Amino acid sequence: QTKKVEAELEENILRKCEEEKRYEAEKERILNEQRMQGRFVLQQQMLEK
Amino acid sequence: MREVISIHVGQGGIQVGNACWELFCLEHGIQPDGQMPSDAFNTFFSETGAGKHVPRAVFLDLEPTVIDEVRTGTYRQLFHPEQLISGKEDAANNFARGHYTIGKEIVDLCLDRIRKLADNCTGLQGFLVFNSVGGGTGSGLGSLLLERLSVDYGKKSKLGFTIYPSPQVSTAVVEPYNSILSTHSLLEHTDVAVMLDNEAIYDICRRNLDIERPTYTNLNRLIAQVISSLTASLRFDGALNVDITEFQTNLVPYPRIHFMLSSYAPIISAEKAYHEQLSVAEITNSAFEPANMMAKCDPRHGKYMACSMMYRGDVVPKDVNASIATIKTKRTIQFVDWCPTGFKVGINYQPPTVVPGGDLAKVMRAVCMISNSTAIAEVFSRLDHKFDLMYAKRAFVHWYVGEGMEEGEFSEAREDLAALEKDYEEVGIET
Amino acid sequence: MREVISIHVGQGGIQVGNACWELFCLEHGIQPDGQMPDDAFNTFFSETGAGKHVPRAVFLDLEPTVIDEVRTGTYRQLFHPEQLISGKEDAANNFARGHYTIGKEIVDLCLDRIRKLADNCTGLQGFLVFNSVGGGTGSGLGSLLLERLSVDYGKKSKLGFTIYPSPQVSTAVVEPYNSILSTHSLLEHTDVAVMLDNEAIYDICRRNLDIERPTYTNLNRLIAQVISSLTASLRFDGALNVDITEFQTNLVPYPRIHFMLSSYAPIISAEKAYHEQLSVAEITNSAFEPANMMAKCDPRHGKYMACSMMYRGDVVPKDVNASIATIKTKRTIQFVDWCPTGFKVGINYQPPTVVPGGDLAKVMRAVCMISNSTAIAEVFSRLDHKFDLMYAKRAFVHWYVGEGMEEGEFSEAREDLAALEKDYEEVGIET
Amino acid sequence: GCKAMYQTTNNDYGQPFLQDNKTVPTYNELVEAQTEVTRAEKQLKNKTVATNVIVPKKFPLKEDSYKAPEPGLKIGNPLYMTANREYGMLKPTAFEIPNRFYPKDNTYSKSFPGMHKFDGLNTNITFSKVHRALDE
Amino acid sequence: MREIVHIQGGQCGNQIGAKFWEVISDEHGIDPTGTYHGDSDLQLERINVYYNEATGGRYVPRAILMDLEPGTMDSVRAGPFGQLFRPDNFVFGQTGAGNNWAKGHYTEGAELIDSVLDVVRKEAEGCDCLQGFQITHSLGGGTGSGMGTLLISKVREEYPDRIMETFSVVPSPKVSDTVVEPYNATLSVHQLVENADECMVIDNEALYDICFRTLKLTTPTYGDLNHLVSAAMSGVTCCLRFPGQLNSDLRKLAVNLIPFPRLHFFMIGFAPLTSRGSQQYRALTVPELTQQMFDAKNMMCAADPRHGRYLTASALFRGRMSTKEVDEQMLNVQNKNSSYFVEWIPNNIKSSICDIPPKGLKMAVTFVGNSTAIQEMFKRVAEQFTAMFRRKAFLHWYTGEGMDEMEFTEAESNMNDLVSEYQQYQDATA
Ligand SMILES: Nc1nc2c(ncn2[C@@H]2O[C@H](COP(=O)(O)OP(=O)(O)OP(=O)(O)O)[C@@H](O)[C@H]2O)c(=O)[nH]1
Ligand SMILES: Nc1nc2c(ncn2[C@@H]2O[C@H](COP(=O)(O)OP(=O)(O)OP(=O)(O)O)[C@@H](O)[C@H]2O)c(=O)[nH]1
Numbered sequence A: 001q002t003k004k005v006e007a008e009l010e011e012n013i014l015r016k017c018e019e020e021k022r023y024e025a026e027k028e029r030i031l032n033e034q035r036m037q038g039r040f041v042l043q044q045q046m047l048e049k
Numbered sequence B: 001m002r003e004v005i006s007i008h009v010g011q012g013g014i015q016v017g018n019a020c021w022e023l024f025c026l027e028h029g030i031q032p033d034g035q036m037p038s039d040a041f042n043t044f045f046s047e048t049g050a051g052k053h054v055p056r057a058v059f060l061d062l063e064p065t066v067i068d069e070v071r072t073g074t075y076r077q078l079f080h081p082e083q084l085i086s087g088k089e090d091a092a093n094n095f096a097r098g099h100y101t102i103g104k105e106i107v108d109l110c111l112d113r114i115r116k117l118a119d120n121c122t123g124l125q126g127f128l129v130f131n132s133v134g135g136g137t138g139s140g141l142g143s144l145l146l147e148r149l150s151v152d153y154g155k156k157s158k159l160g161f162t163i164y165p166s167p168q169v170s171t172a173v174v175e176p177y178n179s180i181l182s183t184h185s186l187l188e189h190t191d192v193a194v195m196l197d198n199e200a201i202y203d204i205c206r207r208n209l210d211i212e213r214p215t216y217t218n219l220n221r222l223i224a225q226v227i228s229s230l231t232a233s234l235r236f237d238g239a240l241n242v243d244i245t246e247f248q249t250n251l252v253p254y255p256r257i258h259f260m261l262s263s264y265a266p267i268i269s270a271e272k273a274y275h276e277q278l279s280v281a282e283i284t285n286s287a288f289e290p291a292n293m294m295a296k297c298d299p300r301h302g303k304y305m306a307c308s309m310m311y312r313g314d315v316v317p318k319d320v321n322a323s324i325a326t327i328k329t330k331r332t333i334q335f336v337d338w339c340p341t342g343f344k345v346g347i348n349y350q351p352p353t354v355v356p357g358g359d360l361a362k363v364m365r366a367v368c369m370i371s372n373s374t375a376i377a378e379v380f381s382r383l384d385h386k387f388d389l390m391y392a393k394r395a396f397v398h399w400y401v402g403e404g405m406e407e408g409e410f411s412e413a414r415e416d417l418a419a420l421e422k423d424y425e426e427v428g429i430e431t
Numbered sequence C: 001m002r003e004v005i006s007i008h009v010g011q012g013g014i015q016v017g018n019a020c021w022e023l024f025c026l027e028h029g030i031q032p033d034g035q036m037p038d039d040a041f042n043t044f045f046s047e048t049g050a051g052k053h054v055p056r057a058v059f060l061d062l063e064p065t066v067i068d069e070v071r072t073g074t075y076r077q078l079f080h081p082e083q084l085i086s087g088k089e090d091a092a093n094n095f096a097r098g099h100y101t102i103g104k105e106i107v108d109l110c111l112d113r114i115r116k117l118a119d120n121c122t123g124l125q126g127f128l129v130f131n132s133v134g135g136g137t138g139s140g141l142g143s144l145l146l147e148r149l150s151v152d153y154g155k156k157s158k159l160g161f162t163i164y165p166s167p168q169v170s171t172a173v174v175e176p177y178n179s180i181l182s183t184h185s186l187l188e189h190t191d192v193a194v195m196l197d198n199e200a201i202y203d204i205c206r207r208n209l210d211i212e213r214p215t216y217t218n219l220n221r222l223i224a225q226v227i228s229s230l231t232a233s234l235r236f237d238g239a240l241n242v243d244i245t246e247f248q249t250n251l252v253p254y255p256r257i258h259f260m261l262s263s264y265a266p267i268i269s270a271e272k273a274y275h276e277q278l279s280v281a282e283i284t285n286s287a288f289e290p291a292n293m294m295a296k297c298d299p300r301h302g303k304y305m306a307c308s309m310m311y312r313g314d315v316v317p318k319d320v321n322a323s324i325a326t327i328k329t330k331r332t333i334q335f336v337d338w339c340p341t342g343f344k345v346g347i348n349y350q351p352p353t354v355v356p357g358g359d360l361a362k363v364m365r366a367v368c369m370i371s372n373s374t375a376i377a378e379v380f381s382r383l384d385h386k387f388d389l390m391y392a393k394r395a396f397v398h399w400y401v402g403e404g405m406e407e408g409e410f411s412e413a414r415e416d417l418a419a420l421e422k423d424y425e426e427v428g429i430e431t
Numbered sequence D: 001g002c003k004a005m006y007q008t009t010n011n012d013y014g015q016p017f018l019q020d021n022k023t024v025p026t027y028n029e030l031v032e033a034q035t036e037v038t039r040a041e042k043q044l045k046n047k048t049v050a051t052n053v054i055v056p057k058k059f060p061l062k063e064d065s066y067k068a069p070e071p072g073l074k075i076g077n078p079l080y081m082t083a084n085r086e087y088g089m090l091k092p093t094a095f096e097i098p099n100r101f102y103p104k105d106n107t108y109s110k111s112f113p114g115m116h117k118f119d120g121l122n123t124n125i126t127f128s129k130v131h132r133a134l135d136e
Numbered sequence E: 001m002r003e004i005v006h007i008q009g010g011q012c013g014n015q016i017g018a019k020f021w022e023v024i025s026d027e028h029g030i031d032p033t034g035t036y037h038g039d040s041d042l043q044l045e046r047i048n049v050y051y052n053e054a055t056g057g058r059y060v061p062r063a064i065l066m067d068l069e070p071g072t073m074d075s076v077r078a079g080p081f082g083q084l085f086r087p088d089n090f091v092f093g094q095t096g097a098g099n100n101w102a103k104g105h106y107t108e109g110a111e112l113i114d115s116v117l118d119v120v121r122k123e124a125e126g127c128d129c130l131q132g133f134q135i136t137h138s139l140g141g142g143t144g145s146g147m148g149t150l151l152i153s154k155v156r157e158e159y160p161d162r163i164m165e166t167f168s169v170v171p172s173p174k175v176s177d178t179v180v181e182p183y184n185a186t187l188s189v190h191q192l193v194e195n196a197d198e199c200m201v202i203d204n205e206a207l208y209d210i211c212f213r214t215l216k217l218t219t220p221t222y223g224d225l226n227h228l229v230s231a232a233m234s235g236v237t238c239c240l241r242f243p244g245q246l247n248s249d250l251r252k253l254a255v256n257l258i259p260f261p262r263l264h265f266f267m268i269g270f271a272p273l274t275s276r277g278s279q280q281y282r283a284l285t286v287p288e289l290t291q292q293m294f295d296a297k298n299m300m301c302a303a304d305p306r307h308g309r310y311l312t313a314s315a316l317f318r319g320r321m322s323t324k325e326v327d328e329q330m331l332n333v334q335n336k337n338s339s340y341f342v343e344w345i346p347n348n349i350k351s352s353i354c355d356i357p358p359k360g361l362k363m364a365v366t367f368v369g370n371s372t373a374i375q376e377m378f379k380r381v382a383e384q385f386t387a388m389f390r391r392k393a394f395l396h397w398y399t400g401e402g403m404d405e406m407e408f409t410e411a412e413s414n415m416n417d418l419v420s421e422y423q424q425y426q427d428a429t430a
């Protein structure tokens, strides 16, 4: 069992990395929002000039 | 090491080339004077050794008007000075003038420049040619160039982006005469041809772009986007890449049937593009909406043969296949029986570029679609009726005869269009 | 995953929708621009994927006056610019104009937009439609819209929050005519119809809120509060939740009988709201108080089919059960023979929201009560008597006749009202 | 990457002797000490690797950040004010914002592409009903 | 071994099951993360009856959750002790049943049950030796009242030799919050009588009355009602998990309590229940416990046991005691109250003793009794049903989904036959 519990200890670590891989996906959806706010409003002001 | 040569002949070709080359320069970051401020561009441009870049384009005309506009415009330092060929006398809406009288003294220079450009290339994929068909030098020089390049090169593919007249909105009065003639010459010399009727793009500029007074500049910007979306697979990285040679292997069932029409989506102004998400699910549905077609033709009047979709942006391959099944199961889109699989899809990662001072909005995902369908037979039928009505009483025929054109050539062009119509009619039926 | 689409047709519908939407935006914290400065808004709104939210609403009218006010006000940025459909020429209090002459030139675009909106949704619960009866566009476009929807969609629930003319106070002279046709149309196409006539709301304001000059702005807010109380169980967690589908399954004894009236409590001004405890035991009596009905009807003259009441705030489930027992033990409130139990009660945690510039006070509890009773026959009877009075001498008939409507269209509507009265009278008797 | 993962069979052949010859536990204590041995066996994995009332959440918008918008049209005087645009004129203040919030979170249900149907092959095994030992 | 699998349906069933699992986890010393934190060895000897062993050494319930809307499951997952449930075991629809028995038994349930039956088959296949099933559902709601009966039917078809227990909440004439309650109540009872091995009925009115009179607390809540129901549910199966003087499992209880196959409706109760202020005054012994046992207002049903006669009754004691005093108390009570006890079955009381008292209490009792008085609920439900059905009110929804008046007539006749043959033994004499 001592070697056993060492094995399942690794799956828990593999769980943590998978959650972080989901976290970077949250960072990915920042891209469209970042590219939306500052710069899509400017394209509405180009016609105002 | 893959290149492509673009040929601009006639006023329409030149004025669409101005916009397309502005878009290419903006996309690749090259300044108007040719310098790059501090390897993918090799498809369109060529290095001078230290600094500026010279496009692989040649401009042809007989009127020195639009050429002199380029030679003194902001792009005067970009193009090679002695590949902006200009003539002295205009063809003046006469097909025989640009094919028998005043085109023979100028076609020699264009061939030499094309040979010089090709000798510099190493992986030449093919040729792009833009020309207005309802005109004299556009149809006259366009036929001669294709005829010469055929016997000069052979197996190099040629892509033509022509502008046929609208069903009811057109300028010239003799354009049914020369539109028929040029189609005869390009049918057996062009591998892929695209229909770009003017009236269709006017309506697209209205409904989507909220523009009440469109102009030729607005239309030419739409075509440049289509060209860029078509050729971005050569010069940008993507999950699924498609070459020029991988166009005429999936869209042309038979060697004669290669006249096709295009569409683009999404087309929308920025004032209302940000009230909705523009997901891949619907932008692929809009591409098949008949009102969004770039040629004034109704796809509901015939079957489909083969459809090509080129996605660019951040599309996911799973999402693409999920939307395609919806199109297949839709009951108002009908494919021909002998084509079970009808889609060839390519995906690119580069998002579409936006030109300052334009009218379009910028979106995360864009699809450009090229479809070959039997509905393209109606534009030939309606074009034939006008020519028959005029040729019954033989109007304007004396203008063409006196320039060296035989009387009997008008009949031969008429007969082969009938053959093409019969070919479409016999191929559209089921087994 | 739960959605509901709201349709506002007519000036009354638009002006009620303005108040309801400002209330919803304030409730969910969305700024009038539409940018927020976990997922509860999904019932009424839709994320665009980056930032802004857009309502699931469509505005219809034939005149530009009221719509242009919305497109210029502070709430302009919230709506999609295209989902505000407006005409050019008004119906001018003519039902025949809005159902046969000019209403047919707008229905296609509205239905296309409705289809586009419903494609986005996934768990569409039903539709909310707001329209006044005594107008051409409210009656003409309402009938056509519900008729088209009943065959386009089918089994989806549709709820009609309709405003009938008051027994004696009205602004038009021909509204008895176009009232009957609306009933004939909606009786066979609306799942649940709510009576919200204006005179009853006038008395409530003067009696409780201490307002001596009530304007249409005050009345619309009460309707918004009623809608919010009705639909809060879809977007706020509660002990006993009730869906949109859990109104027709419990409040409709027979398919023909679905006309019902509402009551809301408490409605107390802030200057006297703190002289009483507003207990759940006493606020439930104000809901059943005969003169507090939002429709000018007397429940003391008839029996009850069933009664649905929804509590929000900090009520306790054991508190309401005692109150229902007290109401049952009361002898002046008599239910129908074949309904031993007739109460359906819901409870929600979220207290009502107060809007700045309003009239209602801030309280920890509220009751919204929707009851079905035999007493609703009186409004039909009085409108029938008015119609019989005016139709005797063929008054105003030529206006409707000249707009494509047959002469015999009134007789079938009269027979329909007679049949409805007969059905109510037959159901009301004991066994 | 675990070092204990790389231990392999055929190393189980003779390898020393954990209990030395001079400290043999008597039979009496081995019987007595089975309580901890069973206790250690059961909860060894549980301690090594295995390790009310509703509450309202905060309102999304803060008072200091409403950012009221300026109307598109240019009105000049209060005379031309119309009752139709009375809605939304006043920005909300501290008093009237709701004290408690009870929204519905659908993150968990925004999953489960669908329900599952067992497209498999039995693999049941029968464990018998009476004193498993006559089963196969 | 001899494990039992838990399945729940509907909002009421889910709320009952969540509190039941909290009670079970508190009894077995399991934190909301599935890690054992207990102290005694007995708390882990028989943990496999209710729990499964997963990787890492954590425990998970073998519970199956069924519903038609995602709201209840999303709430129970976010609630406390919700992390124990395996995500795969969640099966639900997307439209809802709408308080319509026809909708929840013929249209949506018919398509949805495939997945839940698959999950149930997997859980019952993975177990060592199946003992039976226990189900918590409501008889007044659409999805519960429909899918519970349908799933009982198919599970009885698949496993004819098991034991099936149902903890049903029936509607009362006083506190009624649904206008269509009699219809689906009759339809559910008609199907339940033919399939359920054991059925235990619970009354919301009785629960509120208990909270108001015995506990004497100002504001009762569904949490407290679910707590009472969960304690009652754990009482019956405690002796299966812990050793005692006289252990007796569900099958033995059924054999002892069911004289005839169709009379398998029981009414339950719990003891002791004391207000917060009077605990230190009362003495906790077998006499006081049996007083609060046989006391009428401690029952969880609106039926009054002194309006009929007891057929058989059973008492489950927990904690340390002496069997002699328990037997003497039962004999004395039965001898003196012979008027309320049927005569042709003398010595009709069963007793069981468990050695583990509830945490915080030295002694507790769970009472299950089969009395002829339960016919009052059936009679009142039938009266409401026939009053609403003679005029065909609210009937077109049922008739529009493959159902006809023949099923209503058959169900009403079956319930009336049940009532008649159940009253027969109230006046039958030897
Ligand atoms: N899309 C597009 N088409 C154009 C533009 N300018 C001209 N055309 C088309 O060109 C057709 C006539 O040809 P011309 O513009 O006169 O040029 P051409 O074909 O070379 O004939 P010539 O006048 O002899 O030079 C018209 O029917 C137009 O449809 C343009 O800027 N954009
Ligand atoms: N409660 C309420 N009722 C209104 C409001 N505006 C109009 N009404 C009622 O609507 C009735 C007439 O119909 P309107 O909505 O005014 O006119 P319409 O529906 O636009 O029909 P048309 O005038 O032909 O375009 C009047 O008798 C009013 O009682 C409003 O803002 N609130």
Ligand SMILES: Nc1nc2c(ncn2[C@@H]2O[C@H](COP(=O)(O)OP(=O)(O)O)[C@@H](O)[C@H]2O)c(=O)[nH]1
Residues within 6 Å of the ligand: E009, E010, E011, E012, E015, E016, E097, E099, E138, E140, E141, E142, E143, E144, E145, E169, E176, E177, E178, E204, E222, E223, E225, E226
């Ligand atoms: N004991 C208890 N009963 C409840 C609870 N919630 C609802 N109920 C009862 O369940 C009935 C409604 O059942 P319903 O939710 O429609 O059942 P479903 O259709 O299967 O979800 C009501 O009459 C309530 O008395 C609860 O938390 N505890």
Ligand SMILES: [Mg+2]
Residues within 6 Å of the ligand: C011, C063, C090, C135, C137
């Ligand atoms: Mg109007």
